[PDB]
């Protein structure tokens, strides 16, 4: 098992998934005016994550570095897309497309969480195989409560 106490990437991924889960929990009752803050808090935890990953990359071999950068780029694309579904939903607050728009917000935010986990995995592999990891379900639990 992996020791997560000092592990800023793991902790930042957990915070990301928690912000996505807060978006989901607030969405149904939120007025359109309140959509910006909950997507921004997701993006803020992505900024922290990418920050802690960046700090790590120069210690990894070029192989791992490239593939980790692939995962980060995807996360950014995921946020860009959540921002797009957020705007659609705002513009449809007073139409009968509001519910569908919000469903598509949730899909986009869920996709982001899933890929945050996938970044965690590629980081762990890169550490493991570069003798950088430290040995000794919660992440998946958050994803499960979200999957509902």
């Amino acid at each position: 098992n992996l020791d997560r106490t000092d592990d800023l990437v793991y902790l930042n991924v957990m915070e990301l998934v928690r912000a996505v889960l807060e978006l989901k929990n607030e969405l149904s009752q939120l007025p359109p005016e309140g959509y910006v803050v909950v997507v921004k808090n997701v993006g803020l935890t992505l900024r922290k994550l990418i920050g802690s990953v960046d700090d790590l990359l120069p210690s990894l071999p070029s192989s791992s570095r490239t593939e980790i950068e692939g995962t980060q780029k995807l996360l950014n694309k995921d946020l860009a897309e959540l921002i797009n579904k957020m705007r659609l939903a705002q513009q449809n607050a007073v139409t009968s497309l509001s519910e569908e728009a919000k469903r598509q917000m949730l899909t986009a935010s869920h996709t982001l969480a899933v890929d945050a986990k996938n970044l965690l995995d590629a980081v762990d592999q890169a550490k493991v195989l570069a003798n950088l990891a430290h040995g000794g379900e919660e992440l998946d639990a958050l994803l499960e409560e979200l999957e509902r």
């Binding site: 910006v36 803050v37 997507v39 921004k40 993006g43 803020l44 992505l46 900024r47 990418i50 920050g51 990953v53 960046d54 990359l57 950068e69 980060q72 780029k73 950014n76 946020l79 860009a80 921002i83």
Partner: peptide, 19 residues
């Protein structure tokens, strides 16, 4: 300030301008 951090700051700058 890699490409990912720069691309992300770009996305975040948009959200902040529409609150």
């Amino acid at each position: 300030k890699t490409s990912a951090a720069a691309q992300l700051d770009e996305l975040m700058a948009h959200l902040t301008e529409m609150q």
